[PDB]
Structure formats: C-alpha cells, structure tokens
C-alpha cells in the first residue's frame, strides 16, 4: 500500500517514484499540486513524518516569495493553511507506507519506508549511484 506526493517536474520526486518501483511495487500517485490532500489529511502526514509544519514548506515559489513567508510571524496552523490554499507550497516528495511516512528529501531517505529491498541496483538520473547490485547503500 504506497502513495507518493508526486511532481513530475521534480528530479527529486521522479528518483523517489523511480525507486519505490525498484523495490517491485506501482504506488498510488498524487498530483497533490491539482490534489492536494484535504487539512486533515495534511495535518496527519505532518505528524507522521516528525517534522515542522515549516520544515515542510516550499521556498523559491510564488506564494512562498509574495505571502512573505521567511519571515517569522505565522503559526504552524497559518502555515498549513497557506499550505492547503497553495499546494505549490507542499515540498516533494512525500511517500506513505505500511511502514511510515517521509519527505523523501533526499530521495534514498526513501529507502528507509519500502518494506522490500531494492531488487537491483539503483542510480539517480543524473548518474548519482544510490545502492549497487549487492544492495548496499553507496
Ligand atoms: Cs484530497
Ligand atoms: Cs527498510
Ligand atoms: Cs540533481
């Protein structure tokens, strides 16, 4: 059962699906930027993943620059609400599994929620290699 977050535009959200696909299972994928999870869904992947609302935020996007949001002066509910009415503001990817839910930044953070083992070694697009055919992480 696993669901990825995922932007096709992001090279660190294709290695994640690429991955998660290396470990022999198809996920559900989520465009979130056209469906965005609902607030109570966002609030519990939050939760899941250990960490800050603000860890969670996008920067060098639109509403990031133009709501002001560097700036110290919103609450984490503020935050998830920009979050909700800007889904741009959602950083990538975000994976579910039966074993736990990760902002897969970097993408081998992956690695750590997939129940079965790479089936072969794996190498990033741009020629990163990530485990080799043995299985350890390089
Ligand atoms: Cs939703
Ligand atoms: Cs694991
Ligand atoms: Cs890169």
């Not at 699906?17 to 470990?23: H, K, P, Y």
């Amino acid at each position: 059962n696993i669901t990825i977050y995922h932007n096709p535009a992001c090279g660190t959200s294709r290695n994640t699906l690429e991955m998660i696909r290396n470990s022999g299972t198809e996920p559900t994928i989520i465009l979130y930027l056209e469906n965005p999870p609902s607030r109570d869904e966002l609030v519990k992947l939050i939760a899941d993943m250990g960490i800050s609302v603000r860890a969670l935020l996008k920067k060098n996007v639109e509403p990031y620059e133009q709501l002001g949001l560097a700036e110290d002066k919103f609450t984490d509910d503020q935050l998830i609400d920009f979050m909700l009415q800007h889904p741009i503001l959602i950083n990538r990817p975000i994976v579910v599994t039966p074993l736990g839910t990760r902002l897969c930044r970097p993408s081998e953070v992956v690695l750590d929620i997939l129940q079965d083992a790479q089936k072969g070694a794996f190498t990033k697009e741009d020629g990163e290699k990530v485990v080799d055919e043995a299985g350890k992480r390089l």
